[PDB]
Design a protein around this nucleic acid. Structure first.
Lengths: 68, 75, 94, 68, 75, 94, 88
RNA sequence: UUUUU
C-alpha cells in the first residue's frame, strides 16, 4: 500500500504541483507543511494568466491534488 | 492577536466589507470570535452588476453574521 | 454565548432576518439557540409579491447558517450594556 | 512555520479566492489565517481600487499570502 | 471508515473535478494515493501519481462494471 | 430545537437550492436533518401554473435547509395554489 | 424520530439520493455512518440534466455532498412501530 | 465531513 502524508513528506525539498478544486494550479519547490512553497508559479487554468511568487503560504482548504 | 485590531474598534465606527459586493459603515457595539457583530447606526451599500448601480439602506441596529465578513477596517 | 444571550433578550420583539438567499423575513422573535437558529412567529415576507410561497406560513424556523443580517429597532437594545457584555465575554474566553 | 518570523512586519500579498488582492505591511497572522495589515491597498482586476489604513482579513477568504 | 486495493476506481470531487485511477493506497482520513489517474475535463488530461485529499472526495465507485446505459426507467 | 414545536405537523421547507417541499415533520436532529412523511414539492413559476410533485418520505440534510415553516391549514385552505404565480426562490450563496 | 435512526433503519432497502451537483442515485443502501456517508449497491446514477445514465455495481457517496434522501414509507412505518415497541 | 463556508 501507500501512505499519503508519507508521500508528501517524500516531497519536502522537491518540486510539487498542487491543483485546487477551482481551476487553478501552483507549481514550485516545496518548503514545508496550509503549505509553504518556494519559487512557485501560479497558473490560472481558465484565463491563462500566470504569475510567479518567490515564496508563499498557500491555504490548504482549497487544494484537491498533490503531484510530485 | 489579529482580532486585537477589531478589539480596538469597540464603540468606534468601522467599515465592513462583506461577501456579495456589500459594505457596511456602522458603530461596532459587539463582536465575537466568528466576527458576528452588532453594528449601530449602520449604512449598507450594495453594488449591483463595471457596476450598474448601488443601493444604500440605513439600519438603526443590525446584527451581521461573521461568515459573510471579508474585512474590517477604519472608515 | 454573547450573541445568543443578546438574541434571547430580543425575544418577544420584532426583528427582520435577511437571508443569504436575499429574502428578508419579518416577525416576532420567539426562540434562538446556541447555533443562532432562530424562530419567528407571525412572519410576513418583505417582498410578498415576489414570494407568495409562504402565504400560508405564520410560524417559521430559519437556520442560523443562512442569516446575513438580523436587523431590529434600537429601542429594545442597550448598546453600553451590550458592549460591556462583549468586553466581559472576550475577557472570559481570553 | 518559520515563514511567519521571516514575513511578519514586512509587506505581503493576500489573494482571496474571490480574486481581489491586498498588499500591505503584515502585522499579524493566526492559525485560521486571519490577518492584520498596517496600510492595506486593494487591487481588483489588478487595478488599485481602495486603500485602508489597517485591515483585518478573515482567514477563510484568503487563498494565499505571498512575500515581498 | 465505511470503506479495492490495486483495482481501478473513479472518484469525483466537490467543485466538479472527476478523475480515474487505480487505487494503490489509502489511510483513514480517506486520503487516497492513486496512480495513473487521469481527470476528465469539462476530453482528458493525465496527472501521473497523485495523492488525493480525503476532505474533497464526493464519490468513489469501482470502474469495473460502471457503464453508460440508455434510459432504464419508466416514461 | 424550536423544531420540536413543528413535530407531526404540516411543514414547508425552503432548501438552499430554492425548492419548496411540504410534509409531516417526523423527526429532526441538531444539524437540522429532517424526516418528512407524505411530502410533496411545489414548483411555483411566473410563466406556468404551479406544479405539485409527490415525494413520499423525505430525509433532508441540514446543510441544505434554509427555512422550515409551519403551514396554517385554514389560511392555506383559503389559498388557491393552482393559479398562483411567483418568482423562483434564489439559491443560498455562502 | 431521529433522521439517522431512519437512515440506519433503511440499510438493506432501496434509497434515492440526490447530491448537490444534481445527480441522483437509485440503489440499495447497505451502509452508512453518523456523518451520513453512504455505500449503496446496484445503483443507477442519473446526471443532472437527466441526460446521461450510468449503472454502478456499488458506490460510495460522501455525506457532506448530499442534498436529500428518499426512503420507502414502510421503513419509516417499521421504525415508528419499533420505537412504539421499545417504550413498553 | 452538515451551524461561522
Amino acid at each position: 500500500t501507500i501512505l499519503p502524508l508519507e508521500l508528501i513528506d517524500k516531497c519536502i525539498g522537491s518540486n510539487l504541483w498542487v491543483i485546487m478544486k477551482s481551476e487553478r494550479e501552483f507549481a514550485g519547490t516545496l518548503v514545508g507543511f496550509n503549505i509553504v512553497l518556494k519559487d512557485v508559479t501560479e497558473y490560472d487554468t481558465v484565463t491563462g494568466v500566470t504569475e510567479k511568487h518567490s515564496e508563499m503560504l498557500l491555504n490548504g482548504n482549497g487544494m484537491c491534488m498533490l503531484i510530485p | 492577536e489579529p482580532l486585537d485590531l477589531v478589539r480596538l474598534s469597540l464603540d468606534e465606527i468601522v467599515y465592513v466589507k462583506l461577501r456579495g459586493d456589500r459594505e457596511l459603515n456602522g458603530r461596532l457595539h459587539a463582536y465575537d470570535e466568528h466576527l458576528n457583530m452588532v453594528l449601530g447606526d449602520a449604512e449598507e451599500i450594495v453594488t449591483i452588476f463595471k457596476a450598474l448601480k448601488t443601493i444604500r439602506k440605513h439600519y438603526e441596529m443590525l446584527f451581521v453574521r461573521g461568515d459573510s465578513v471579508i474585512l474590517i477596517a477604519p472608515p | 454565548m454573547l450573541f445568543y444571550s443578546f438574541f434571547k433578550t430580543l425575544i418577544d420583539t420584532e426583528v427582520t432576518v435577511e437571508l443569504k438567499n436575499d429574502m428578508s423575513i419579518r416577525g416576532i422573535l420567539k426562540s434562538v439557540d446556541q447555533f443562532l437558529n432562530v424562530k419567528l412567529e407571525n412572519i410576513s415576507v418583505v417582498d410578498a409579491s415576489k414570494y407568495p410561497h409562504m402565504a400560508a406560513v405564520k410560524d417559521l424556523f430559519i437556520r442560523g447558517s443562512v442569516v446575513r443580517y438580523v436587523h431590529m429597532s434600537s429601542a429594545y437594545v442597550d448598546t453600553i450594556l451590550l458592549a460591556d457584555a462583549c468586553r466581559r465575554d472576550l475577557a472570559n474566553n481570553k | 512555520n518559520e515563514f511567519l518570523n521571516k514575513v511578519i512586519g514586512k509587506k505581503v500579498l493576500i489573494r482571496l479566492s474571490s480574486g481581489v488582492d491586498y498588499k500591505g505591511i503584515l502585522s499579524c497572522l493566526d492559525g485560521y489565517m486571519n490577518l492584520a495589515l498596517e496600510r492595506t491597498e486593494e487591487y481588483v482586476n489588478g487595478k488599485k481600487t481602495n486603500v485602508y489604513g489597517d485591515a483585518f482579513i478573515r482567514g477563510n477568504n484568503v487563498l494565499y499570502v505571498s512575500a515581498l | 471508515s465505511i470503506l479495492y486495493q490495486d483495482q481501478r476506481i473513479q472518484a469525483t470531487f466537490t467543485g466538479g473535478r472527476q478523475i480515474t485511477g487505480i487505487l494503490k493506497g489509502f489511510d483513514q482520513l480517506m486520503n487516497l494515493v492513486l496512480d495513473d489517474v487521469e481527470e476528465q475535463l469539462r476530453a482528458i488530461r493525465k496527472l501521473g501519481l497523485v495523492v488525493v485529499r480525503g476532505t474533497t472526495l464526493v464519490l468513489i465507485a469501482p470502474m469495473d462494471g460502471s457503464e453508460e446505459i440508455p434510459n432504464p426507467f419508466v416514461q | 430545537m424550536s423544531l420540536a414545536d413543528f413535530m407531526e405537523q404540516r411543514v414547508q421547507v425552503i432548501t438552499n437550492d430554492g425548492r419548496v417541499v411540504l410534509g409531516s415533520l417526523k423527526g429532526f436532529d441538531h444539524t437540522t436533518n429532517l424526516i418528512l412523511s407524505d411530502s410533496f414539492e411545489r414548483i411555483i413559476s411566473m410563466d406556468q401554473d404551479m406544479e405539485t410533485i409527490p415525494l413520499g418520505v423525505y430525509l433532508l440534510r441540514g446543510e441544505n435547509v434554509a427555512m422550515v415553516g409551519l403551514v396554517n391549514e385554514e389560511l392555506d385552505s383559503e389559498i388557491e395554489w393552482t393559479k398562483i404565480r411567483g418568482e423562483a426562490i434564489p439559491d443560498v450563496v455562502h | 424520530m431521529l433522521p439517522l435512526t431512519l437512515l440506519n433503519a433503511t440499510q438493506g432497502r432501496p434509497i434515492l439520493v440526490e447530491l448537490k451537483n444534481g445527480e441522483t442515485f437509485n440503489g440499495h443502501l447497505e451502509n452508512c455512518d453518523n456523518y451520513m456517508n453512504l455505500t449503496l449497491r446496484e445503483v443507477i446514477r442519473t446526471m443532472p440534466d437527466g441526460d446521461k445514465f450510468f449503472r454502478l455495481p456499488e458506490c460510495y457517496i460522501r455525506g457532506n455532498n448530499i442534498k436529500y434522501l428518499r426512503i420507502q414509507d414502510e421503513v419509516l412505518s417499521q421504525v415508528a412501530k419499533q420505537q412504539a415497541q421499545q417504550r413498553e
